[PDB]
Design a protein around this ligand. Structure first.
Ligand SMILES: Nc1nc2c(ncn2[C@@H]2O[C@H](CO)[C@H]3O[C@H](P(=O)(O)O)O[C@H]32)c(=O)[nH]1
Ligand SMILES: Nc1nc2c(ncn2[C@@H]2O[C@H](CO)[C@H]3O[C@H](P(=O)(O)O)O[C@H]32)c(=O)[nH]1
Ligand SMILES: Nc1nc2c(ncn2[C@@H]2O[C@H](CO)[C@H]3O[C@H](P(=O)(O)O)O[C@H]32)c(=O)[nH]1
Ligand SMILES: [Mg+2]
Ligand SMILES: [Mg+2]
Ligand SMILES: [Mg+2]
Ligand SMILES: [Zn+2]
Ligand SMILES: [Zn+2]
Ligand SMILES: [Zn+2]
Lengths: 272, 272, 272
C-alpha cells in the first residue's frame, strides 16, 4: 500500500463532488466486456486520467441500470502490466468510501473443465490464488483497521445468496445452455500457458484460468463488500500435444447480448 | 540481505555485553505460545526495540530452562507484515554469532490431515516452501561464506535424532494422545485459505498449514544450526462447502500446560 | 525491464563493431557445460565485464561450429543471485538484435522421472514456470512491440522440427542409451529441495528440476527466436525418507565428450 488512508479519502471526495450519482453497486468489466455501460441511464463518465490518484489503464461510468444506481469500471488493471496489487485494487477501496455495498466482478477466461464450451458463462463459486501462495497479496503490509481486519476469512468470499439469485434469474431468461459454476485460478501472465501447466492447473481443481479478479475480490472482502462474479469462457484450453488476444476479443462481442441482459436482470435482486 | 556481515556482528556484540547469559539453544515462540518464557530462571529480557538492528514486531528473553541455557523469541516476524525474508530471519544469524548450536521453532497451524484433532502437537518431519518456488527466499542474493554454502541441502533439515528423542520424551510424559508427525506447508497470508486452496494443499502432501517458520529453518540450516520443531493444531480446516484469530489465540492457552512441560523436558536431551 | 530499447541497441552495436563474426545460432552453456566453446574455430572471446550493459556472472565466445556461425554464453545468470528476470535475460534480446535466429539452451538438472538415470540427456519438450504463476516474469511491465506481442503463446515454445532432427542425429551417433524427453520445471533456489517438495513436483508432471532456462525461453519466444534445449541429468532425486554442487560439477565432465559431439552435429541441421 503506497497510498495513505487520506489518499483514498481525497479521491472519494473528488468523485462525490463531481457527480450527483450515489452508487450502491460497482461492476468491474473485463476484457471485451465493456459494452455493458451502454445501457446506463443518466450516465456520467470520467476517464481514469481525470481522477486524482487513479492508476493508468479506461474510464469510470456512473448511472442507473434497471433501477439500481451503479458505477462501472470500463477496463481494469493487471499485475502483468507491472503494477503492484495495491495499485491494481485501489478502486475497490474508493468504492467502499463512496458507499458502495456490493461488487460484481467479471472476466474472460480459458476453460479447464472438459465439459465447458466456448460462450459458456461460469459463475465463480471459489478461487485459487497462486500469487498469494508466495506472498504477493494486496493486503501485504501494515493493516489498516479503518478498512478491515488483519486476518480476513476468504472461504465465504462469493456470496451464496447472490449465486442462487443468479441461477433463478438465468432460468427466467430461458437460456438453452445451463449456467455453469466453478473454481477460478489466477496466474500472473502475460504469456499464455504451456500444455504441462494447463494439465497441472486442472489437477489442482481449477475450472477456468485467467490473469485478474482474485486481488480485487480479496480487497473487497477485507473492507466488507458483498461479492458476486463470473467468467466468460472464451476458449477451451488444449490439454494434449494456439491462443491469441483477438480470440478473446471476438468472443467478447459474441456473447454481448447475453451478458448485458443477465447483468441487467441481476440488479433487480441484489438486494438493496 | 540488506544487512552487512558487520551489522550481525554489532548486534551480537551488544547482546554479549548486556547479559552474562550464554545460550546454547534458541527457541522461537509462535502465536499464543509465548508463555514458555515464564519458566526461565535467572531470566533477562530485552524488548526488540532496545536491540540495535532488530526488526519491529516483542522481546528476547535469556535464561535457564531445566538445566539448559536458552534464548527465546517472544513473538516473531512475518512476510505478510511487509518484511522481506532477510529481515524476518535476522535473529537466526545473530543467534549463531552468539554461539547457539540448536534452534527450536514452534507455531500454530491449521490441520489438513483428516486424522488430526484440535490440540494435537505435530512434530515437523519435513516442509514445503511455496514462496521459495517463486524465488522469494532468505538466501536470495550474494552468498556470505562466513555463514554457509551457496547451495545448501534441505532434505535433512529436521534433525532425526531430536525427533526420536521427542517421541521418547512424549512417552515418559504419559500422554493419552499420540504425538503426531507431518509435513508443514507455508504460504504468505494474511488472509485465510479458501476451500479450493485447502483441498489443493492437502493433495500436495501437506499435513498442516501456516504463515511462518520455513524461512527461519532455511537460514538456520545454512549457518549450521541443528533444527527441531512442532506445530500446535489449533483447528481442523474445512474441506467442503469460519477461521479467525481469537480461535488460534484461545487454542494457545488451551494446551499451554502441555507445551511448556514438553519443551522443558526436551532440554534434558538435545544434547550439549 | 530496467533497460531502454536503446540500451539493447548500444550493446549490439558494440559487439558488431568488435568482431567480424555474425552468428545465426546462440547457445547458452549451463553448469559444467562450458567445455563446448573449445571446438569453435576462428573464435573470439569477450569477458562479460568488457561488454557495455552486460550483467555480472563469464564470457561470450563467437566462432564457427561444424560449419555454422555461433555465439555461446560460457556461464549464465540466475534468479537466486538476486537478479530480476529482465537482467537474467538481457543477452537473449541482444542476440536477436545481432541477427541470431535460433537459441539452444542447456542445463544440469535433477531427475524426477523414475526411469531416468545419471548421465541421461533429456530433450526438453515442455516446461512448468513456477515463478511465473506468481507474476515473476521477464515480460512483466510495459510491452515493447519492437520485440514482440503483449500476450505471447508458450505452448509451442520448443520447436518440433528440431526435436525430431535431434532424435535422428542421436541415432546416427549410435548411442546405446536412448535420448530421453520430458518436462522441465524451474524453481528459484538456491537451496536444494526437500523430499516432500520432490514428491510434489513429480505429481505436477515434471520429469526434471532446475533453477534456470525457463526465463530465457520465454524471452526468446517473445522476440521470435526458434528454441531447442536439453538437460543433463546429473543425479536421481530421492523420493523417500544428499545433493551438492560438486556432484553436478563432476557429472558435467563425465558426459563432456557426449554433449560436445551431439551439439556439434545438430548444427548441421538447424537449419539455416
Ligand atoms: N491465463 C489465461 N488467460 C486467458 C485464457 N483464455 C482467456 N484468457 C484471457 O486472455 C486475456 C489476455 O488475452 C486475459 O485477461 C482477461 P481479463 O482477466 O482482463 O478479463 O482474461 C484473460 C487462458 O487460457 N489463460
Ligand atoms: N495459513 C493458515 N494459518 C493458520 C490456520 N490455522 C491456524 N493458523 C495460524 O493462524 C495465524 C493467524 O491468525 C497464523 O500465524 C501463526 P504463527 O505462524 O505466527 O505461529 O500460525 C497461523 C490456517 O488454517 N491457515
Ligand atoms: N533445483 C535443483 N537443481 C538441481 C538438481 N540437480 C541438479 N541441479 C542443478 O544444480 C545446480 C546448483 O548446484 C543448479 O543450477 C544448474 P544450471 O540451471 O545453471 O544449469 O542446474 C541446477 C536438483 O535436484 N534440484
Ligand atoms: Mg492520474
Ligand atoms: Mg530498532
Ligand atoms: Mg559492466
Ligand atoms: Zn472539478
Ligand atoms: Zn548499554
Ligand atoms: Zn573497442
Amino acid at each position: 500500500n503506497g497510498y495513505t488512508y487520506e489518499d483514498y479519502q481525497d479521491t472519494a471526495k473528488w468523485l462525490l463532488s463531481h457527480t450527483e450519482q450515489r452508487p450502491q453497486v460497482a461492476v468491474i468489466c473485463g476484457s471485451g466486456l465493456g459494452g455493458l455501460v451502454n445501457k446506463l441511464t443518466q450516465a456520467q463518465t470520467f476517464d481514469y486520467s481525470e481522477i486524482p490518484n487513479f492508476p493508468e489503464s479506461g474510464r469510470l461510468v456512473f448511472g442507473i441500470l434497471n433501477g439500481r444506481a451503479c458505477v462501472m469500471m470500463q477496463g481494469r488493471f493487471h499485475m502483468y502490466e507491472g503494477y503492484p496489487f495495491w495499485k491494481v485494487t485501489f478502486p475497490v477501496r474508493v468504492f467502499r468510501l463512496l458507499g458502495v455495498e456490493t461488487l460484481v466482478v467479471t472476466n474472460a477466461a480459458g476453460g479447464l473443465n472438459p465439459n465447458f464450451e466456448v460462450g459458456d458463462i461460469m459463475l465463480i463459486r471459489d478461487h485459487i490464488n497462486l500469487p498469494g501462495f508466495s506472498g504477493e497479496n494486496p493486503l501485504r503490509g501494515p493493516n489498516e483497521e479503518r478498512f478491515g481486519v488483519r486476518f480476513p476469512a476468504m472461504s465465504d468470499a462469493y456470496d451464496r445468496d447472490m449465486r442462487q439469485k443468479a441461477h433463478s434469474t438465468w432460468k427466467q431468461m430461458g437460456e438453452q445452455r445451463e449456467l455453469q459454476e466453478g473454481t477460478y485460478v489466477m496466474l500472473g501472465g502475460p504469456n499464455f500457458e504451456t500444455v504441462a501447466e494447463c494439465r497441472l492447473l486442472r489437477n489442482l481443481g481449477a475450472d477456468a484460468v485467467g490473469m485478474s479478479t482474485v486481488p480485487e475480490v480479496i480487497v473487497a472482502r477485507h473492507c466488507g463488500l458483498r461479492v458476486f462474479g463470473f467468467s466468460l469462457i472464451t476458449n477451451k484450453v488444449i490439454m494434449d500435444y494456439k491462443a491469441n488476444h483477438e480470440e478473446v476479443l471476438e468472443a467478447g462481442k459474441q456473447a454481448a447480448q447475453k451478458l448485458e441482459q443477465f447483468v441487467s436482470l441481476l440488479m433487480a435482486s441484489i438486494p438493496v
